[PDB]
């Protein structure tokens, strides 16, 4: 009955009715990993349970990727279409770069063969996981976040080779108006009034990568 | 059931080691090689400052020679050069020249029947049994030279380094026909160079373009050989992380395996106990 | 007879037969419920006869998702319009205690069985995961005073499994084509709820964990899923035979996937990558985008005909498509939309830049 | 190359979806082609017991026998799975029962336990509910003599008693290949054969999937035809060769050019013991 | 008579047209080299550089003075500012000066040019030392070259070619300082 | 071990020092539990362990903290016992380790 | 916070927190006596604090 | 497999300086010196992390 | 797996033994040969992980 | 000898004995590291055969004799 205990407990997190005073609950359990095998008797008994998967690999975290989310076993099916459309806009791009960083990590294990736009995903899907890493502890809004995945889905962050790139998020959040983030904020999606705004503030940044 | 898992970890250890083992011999055999190949290196610039370098010559009949590994291990190296076969073979047809595709190396034979069967003729085997030779070159020369094309190509790759192997086409033209033919700039740049022979120029041509083919298909077939040696380097460096991963993925198992048979075992002699009293 | 389910792994590798038994083994997080809701979104539609939908122990979400979907597509009219429906569900989902996660499989069963008998109709059984009875069933029986049986579970498992199980038959006076998800426990097929569970379904489809860790949606295992009509008696001899072949060619590349870790595939003889590149083809051309699918991705969901499953797979078998790379069958409708996404594929290798000026990005406008 | 004498329990078993049922239905339907030639006291009488099965199943299979007139010769013990776990324990044994009356009276007779792997779990539900202590994987340790008790009453009587036979045909489901299973190990030791198939040789094209490495009968060649005895003896010895030359050339490394043949030659056997669904030839 | 515009250069765009376009251009072995041809200069005063080349080994690259080589029409010496030349040489000793020091080399022959530029590309098969040579066993090899004569054309050049490279070892061995 | 912590918790508390434990080879006092819950008759956990094996360890390695009037620091020796960190004594070990120091031969 | 125990690894590469565990994964004539000698009296000669 | 001199010189003086960090992470100990001879030398946290 | 070689008898001839396998109570020409059999069967059995 | 260890050691070892099994295990230890390298003997690396041969000297050198305690 372990498998109802997990149940009965999970089962009450809910987005509740409007005529029951619109309420809502969410859930956030973590399941201890013995060498990162999903189909374990907890693993497999949760996941069916849960609405998603935020799946932590031990090696992504080795190797100084923290957070280590391994973004293909990670699935949210119930929160996209429910999320923050400015994010949306570029996320879904940020989710095919990631996927062709995945898939050209995976045949490229080793460097030998050099295709030359092929180098291109290897460039961007490194320069983009750069970006999504941060440091603990940290939280950012989502209005300076859809900017930093804004600035990094398209160029302005090619100049760097991958590395400063710890700089170039913080430099781009403390380069651009202030403004802008109240309007992404408040408008919650990146209108053509305020894209080219966006297009416009990007090209000024001082970038300490060269 | 449990018997599968742990000899099959036999298995993938012994290949690993084994790889472990080919790794070392090939990136050893490419460094006795490596005091061989900038020496063969010595004779493929004089002869290309002197004939210059003109590939897409409209020749009658061509040899085109692709020189290719005995031993299958290669690694990216014979299927590049065989594809590399027609697609510097395609780009010098436009009026239908007699072709004369000849595979040097095992491994020729077995992959350039597929794609050019009516135009190939010659397949030289067993080239790096003992080593590379001179001679050997000659002999090889000498059966191209039965035939009497009007030019060569000589498809090889060119070991710069473990990493970059770019194939390499080397040309060698038909004395009289086609070579004194092309230097006709002018008037004729060959004829500032005296000749200093016994009989006349167009057949001193002759000797020097036969040893130009001599030449650089001995340089052709000791590059291949080193490139093939670090290719093979490059190969089983790979079966080796292969043969790591793998076994790592069977010992994670073996190790499930084994927890579930042990607990499955316990929980029936717990079964047959509190059933019993 | 065949029931055209509109996937093409479906209807060409274990077709479902209108008037059986539809199993679905899945193993938490390889898209059972996915699948069957496309099921749904293609079959209880045109399957014009009443539709039965019992939830037994999965998600509740799900089941307030499925409401909320049948009532805006007119499956469930509500209101002053309550008798032209053609759903009635019955859920006894994951909250409930495993009294009742053991029944309510059998409540389900029963308005099926009232549908089949004194009505006469044609009925459509959604048994959503059939495992969660076995699995509350097992749960009660440590307390029921009995022993445990082989890995946990009950000693009644398979004459209490068999029970449930032939009731959901078509009988001389009425049918039920009954689609049963199956949780398997811990991807565990040795398992004695789905081995018990598969020796009562007419045509098994598999769903592995492997086949989605590439990304293949539906993740059904090509090599393992069956049915009864894939015979020659039933389909035509040019279905079969084309069933037959990509079951060749798929389990010629799972012998050589050993090598192919090992060695790679510069190692193997021309007439084997020739099998290998035929295989990663058909491989990927058991996808397709879904109906259902569509709320999280934006790609449109593609209904495939079985006469283009039948063109598209014995074009690929025999090799009238050869030319075209893996991609261009990866996430497609048929074999037009191939050749259409191999024209899109090669025309962005190129034309990729060129958007400096002539934008709307100026201050004035 | 494993032929099928009168007075052998020959056992059947494969994994999930093999030929299992097929190839002993083709045991039955050719029973129908044999005795409308052969005189009426050398005449086999097909006895097919279901245990466990599917009750549709069971309705196809009468409908398949009436289609091709096997009925007439044939009773079909049906246990489906709608009935109690002490009636598929019992119906293997009565299917011997109604079958051992044919070797009773000087008749040859044909007995197939389709699935007695489904015995042995039916006999595992009333031991574990009459309060018997289990042994392994559930089973009580006498699940040998559930079967041994059985099987061995498939015999070739001698020639005062009537002279008669009773040839089986236990069928064994598995998991995996798992023929280290509890169940299976104990009738692969009772019965004379072993006809062991295999699921990746049937979607490979081998139908009948019969793993010839791994099937025997230790009634061997004695008991066959008389023409595929000198035949096919160098048959079972040129598959033999055509796997070990099978499992060298798979890298792509290196070939003989006579070994090329002894593959060959394989080769044209293997798509030679392929046969249709119901053909008896 | 040149109505084939070929090169290195321009096989790059021929190259480009029928070749599928995700392949690298082959190399050729114009690309390896850089002392070229018709490249004005490369003397800068009495050192010209010399190429001394072999099959399997190099055994000089530096710059010369002096070289004589052992031509069909007799030994000649070549200097810095040589004239262009295309030489088949007589099995001989090549002779290497860069000044004061002097080194002899028996060279088995093959070929050597000079181009406009003033640099040599000595281009022998065995470019053997005088050092490794024998003077005992070269009497018995003209003694068994003096001794087969039989009417076949091939043997006749073979063994005339015998008879002429022995004599030269005699003439290279006998008068060393 | 539980002697070893009393011992150690007067020289913590009443002593106010900062004193070091050293519970020697761990799996052992793992396997000691394991034979004294196997004893009395309680039915056995996973893979042969006791079932009360996390909470037994944590009765043990909790009194190891740092206190406001001194700290224990513990230096455990940890045995894997087929060498695997799927085997639920070190998996139930190293969530309360906080740094491991591997030495070598 | 860290405890220093005074070797250098053991106090630069995996620190010692001061009231945590810490795992050794020792082995035979690996000089693992010595090392917990010497903590015992590095800590018990600078932190004023025994060792059992 | 290629040989100690093979590789370039942005490595190679990594080579020598974890040659000799790696020795440096030794230490004496006190408790040895009764069968070793050298006393031990007892180290500071922030003398660690400056001469490394 | 000596059986599906085909060598009829199957027996293993490595793992077979027998307490008649001494040199003093069988002699030793006996002993040596079986040995020697044994050893080569040994080689031959490491040796078919690269055969294979 | 790779798996089978004494944990006394070597401090109750026979003197003499313990001047030569330290370089005995240790040449041994470097030997089933080269150790599954004697079937490529063609390629050779001239130390790393050196160290196999003697690994080859070594044991075969350490057979016994059936109740020949030495
Ligand atoms: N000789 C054959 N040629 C072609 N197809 C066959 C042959 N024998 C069986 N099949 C096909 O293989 C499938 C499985 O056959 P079979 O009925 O023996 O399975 P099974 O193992 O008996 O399944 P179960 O044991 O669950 O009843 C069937 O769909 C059948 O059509
Ligand atoms: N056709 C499809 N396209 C994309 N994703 C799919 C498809 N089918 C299933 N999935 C994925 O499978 C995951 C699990 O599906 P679901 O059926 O909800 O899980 P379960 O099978 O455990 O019920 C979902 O998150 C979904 O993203
Ligand atoms: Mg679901
Ligand atoms: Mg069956």
Not at chain 1, 20 to 42: H, K, N, W
Request: glycine letters at 8%; one cysteine or more; aromatic letters at 8%.
């Amino acid at each position: 009955d372990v498998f109802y205990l997990h149940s009965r407990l999970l089962e009450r997190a809910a987005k509740l009715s409007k005529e029951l005073g619109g309420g809502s609950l969410t859930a956030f359990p973590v399941i201890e990993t013995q060498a990162g095998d999903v189909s374990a008797y907890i693993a497999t008994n949760v996941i069916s349970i849960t609405d998603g998967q935020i799946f932590l690999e031990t090696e992504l975290f080795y190797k100084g990727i923290r957070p280590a989310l391994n973004v293909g076993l990670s699935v949210s099916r119930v929160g996209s279409a429910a999320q923050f459309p400015g994010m949306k806009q570029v996320a879904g791009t940020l989710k095919l770069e990631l996927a062709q960083y995945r898939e050209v990590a995976a045949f490229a294990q080793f460097g030998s063969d050099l295709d030359a736009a092929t180098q291109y995903v290897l460039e961007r899907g490194a320069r983009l996981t750069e970006m999504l890493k941060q440091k603990q502890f940290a939280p950012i809004p989502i209005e300076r976040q859809t900017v930093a995945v804004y600035a990094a889905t398209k160029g302005f962050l090619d100049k760097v080779r991958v590395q400063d790139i710890v700089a170039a998020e913080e430099a781009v959040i403390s380069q651009v108006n202030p403004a802008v983030f109240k309007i992404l904020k408040a408008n919650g999606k990146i209108t053509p009034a305020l894209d080219a705004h966006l297009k416009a503030e990007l090209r000024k940044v001082k970038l300490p990568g060269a | 059931s449990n018997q599968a898992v742990k000899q099959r970890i036999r298995a993938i250890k012994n290949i690993g080691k084994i790889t472990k083992a080919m790794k070392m011999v090939a990136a050893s055999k490419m460094k006795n090689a490596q005091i061989a190949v900038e020496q063969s290196r010595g004779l493929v610039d004089p002869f290309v400052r002197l004939f210059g370098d003109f590939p897409a010559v409209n020749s009658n009949k061509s040899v085109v020679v692709a020189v290719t590994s005995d031993k299958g291990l290669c690694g990216g190296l014979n299927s590049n050069i065989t594809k590399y076969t027609r697609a510097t073979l395609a780009t010098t047809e436009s009026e239908g020249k007699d072709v004369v595709v000849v595979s040097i190396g095992d491994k020729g034979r077995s992959q350039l029947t597929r794609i050019e069967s009516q135009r190939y003729q010659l397949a030289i085997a067993d080239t790096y049994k003992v080593r590379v030779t001179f001679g050997q070159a000659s002999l090889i020369v000498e059966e191209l030279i039965k035939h009497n094309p009007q030019s060569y190509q000589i498809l090889f790759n060119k070991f710069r380094s473990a990493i970059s192997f770019k194939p390499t086409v080397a040309t060698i033209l038909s004395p009289d026909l086609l070579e004194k033919q092309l230097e006709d700039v002018t008037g004729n740049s060959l004829d500032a160079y005296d000749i200093e022979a016994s009989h006349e120029r167009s057949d001193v041509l002759r000797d020097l373009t036969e040893f130009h083919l001599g030449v650089t298909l001995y340089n052709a077939m000791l590059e291949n050989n080193c490139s093939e040696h670090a290719s093979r380097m490059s190969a089983m460096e790979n079966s080796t992380k292969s043969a790591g991963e793998m076994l790592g993925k069977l010992t994670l198992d073996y190790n499930r395996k084994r927890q579930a048979t042990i607990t499955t075992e316990l929980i029936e002699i717990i079964a047959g106990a509190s059933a019993l009293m | 007879e065949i029931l055209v389910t509109g996937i093409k792994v479906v209807d060409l590798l274990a077709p479902y037969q209108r008037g059986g038994k539809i199993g679905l083994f899945g193993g938490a997080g390889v898209g059972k419920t996915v699948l069957i809701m496309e099921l749904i979104n293609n079959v209880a539609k045109a399957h014009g006869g009443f539709s039965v939908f019992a939830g037994v122990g999965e998600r509740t979400r799900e089941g307030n998702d499925l409401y909320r979907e049948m009532i805006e597509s007119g499956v469930i009219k509500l209101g002053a319009e309550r008798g032209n429906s053609k759903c009635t569900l019955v859920y006894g989902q994951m909250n409930e205690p495993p009294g009742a996660r053991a029944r309510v499989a059998l409540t389900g069963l029963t308005v099926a069985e009232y549908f089949r008998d004194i009505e006469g109709q044609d009925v459509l059984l959604f048994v959503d995961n059939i495992f969660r009875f076995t699995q509350a069933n097992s749960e009660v029986s440590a307390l029921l005073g009995r022993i445990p049986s082989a890995v946990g579970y009950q000693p009644t498992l398979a004459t209490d499994l068999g029970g449930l199980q032939e009731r959901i038959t078509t009988t001389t006076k009425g049918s039920i084509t009954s689609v049963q998800a199956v949780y398997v426990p811990a991807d565990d097929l040795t398992d004695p709820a789905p081995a018990t569970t598969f020796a009562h379904l007419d045509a098994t489809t598999v769903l592995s964990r492997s086949i989605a860790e590439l990304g293949i949606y539906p993740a059904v295992d090509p090599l393992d899923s069956t049915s009864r009509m894939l015979n020659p008696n039933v389909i035509g001899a040019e279905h079969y035979n084309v069933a037959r072949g990509v079951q060749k060619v798929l389990q010629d590349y799972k012998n050589l996937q050993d090598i192919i870790a090992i060695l790679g595939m510069d190692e193997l003889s021309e007439e084997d990558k020739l099998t290998v590149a035929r295989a990663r083809k058909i491989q990927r051309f058991l996808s397709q985008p879904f109906q259902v699918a569509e709320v999280f991705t934006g790609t449109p969901g593609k209904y495939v005909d079985l006469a283009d499953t039948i063109s598209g797979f014995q074009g690929v078998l025999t090799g009238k498509y050869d030319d075209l790379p893996e991609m261009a069958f990866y996430m497609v409708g048929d074999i037009k939309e191939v050749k259409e996404k191999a024209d899109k594929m090669a025309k962005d290798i190129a034309s990729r830049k060129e958007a400096d000026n002539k934008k709307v990005s100026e201050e004035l406008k | 190359l494993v032929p099928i004498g009168r007075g052998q329990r020959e056992l059947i078993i494969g994994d999930r979806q093999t030929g299992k049922t097929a190839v002993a239905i083709d045991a039955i339907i050719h029973q129908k082609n044999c005795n409308e030639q052969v005189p009426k006291a050398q005449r086999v009488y097909c006895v097919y017991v279901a245990v466990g099965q599917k009750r549709s199943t069971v309705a196809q299979l009468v409908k398949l026998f009436t289609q091709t007139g096997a009925m007439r010769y044939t009773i079909m013990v049906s246990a489906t799975a709608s009935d109690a776990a002490p009636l598929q324990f019992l119906a293997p044994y009565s299917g011997c029962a109604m079958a051992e009356y044919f070797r009773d009276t000087g008749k040859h007779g044909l007995i197939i336990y389709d699935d007695l792997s489904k015995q042995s779990v039916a006999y595992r539900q009333m031991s574990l509910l009459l309060r018997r202590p289990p042994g392994r994987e559930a089973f009580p340790g006498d699940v040998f003599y559930l079967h041994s008790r059985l099987l061995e009453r498939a015999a070739k009587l001698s020639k005062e008693l009537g002279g008669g036979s009773l040839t089986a045909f236990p069928v064994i489901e598995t998991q995996a290949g798992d023929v280290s299973a509890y169940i299976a190990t104990n009738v692969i030791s009772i019965t004379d054969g072993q006809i062991f198939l295999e699921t990746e040789l049937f979607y490979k094209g081998i139908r009948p999937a019969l793993n010839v490495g791994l099937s025997v009968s230790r009634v061997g060649s004695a008991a066959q035809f008389p023409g595929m005895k000198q035949v096919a003896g160098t048959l079972k010895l040129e598959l033999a060769q055509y796997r070990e030359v099978a499992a060298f050339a798979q890298f792509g490394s290196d070939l003989d050019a006579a070994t090329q043949y002894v593959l060959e030659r394989g080769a044209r056997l293997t798509e030679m013991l392929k046969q249709k669904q119901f053909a008896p030839i | 008579e040149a109505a084939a515009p070929a090169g290195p250069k321009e096989f790059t765009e021929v190259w480009n047209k029928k070749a599928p376009s995700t392949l690298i251009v082959p190399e050729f072995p114009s690309n390896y080299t850089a002392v070229k041809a018709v490249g004005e200069g490369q003397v800068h005063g009495d050192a010209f550089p010399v190429n001394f080349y072999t099959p399997h080994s190099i055994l000089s690259q530096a710059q010369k003075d002096t070289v004589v080589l052992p031509g069909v029409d007799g030994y000649f010496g070549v200097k810095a500012s040589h004239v262009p030349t295309i030489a088949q040489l007589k099995p001989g000793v090549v002779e290497l000066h860069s000044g004061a020091e002097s080194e002899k080399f028996f060279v088995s022959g093959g070929f050597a040019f000079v181009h406009p530029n003033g640099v040599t590309d000595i281009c022998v098969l065995e470019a053997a030392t005088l050092d490794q040579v024998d003077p005992a066993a070269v009497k018995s090899a003209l003694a068994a070259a003096s001794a087969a004569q039989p009417t076949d054309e091939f043997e006749q050049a073979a063994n005339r070619a015998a008879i002429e490279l022995y004599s030269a070892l005699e003439s290279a061995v006998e008068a060393k300082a």
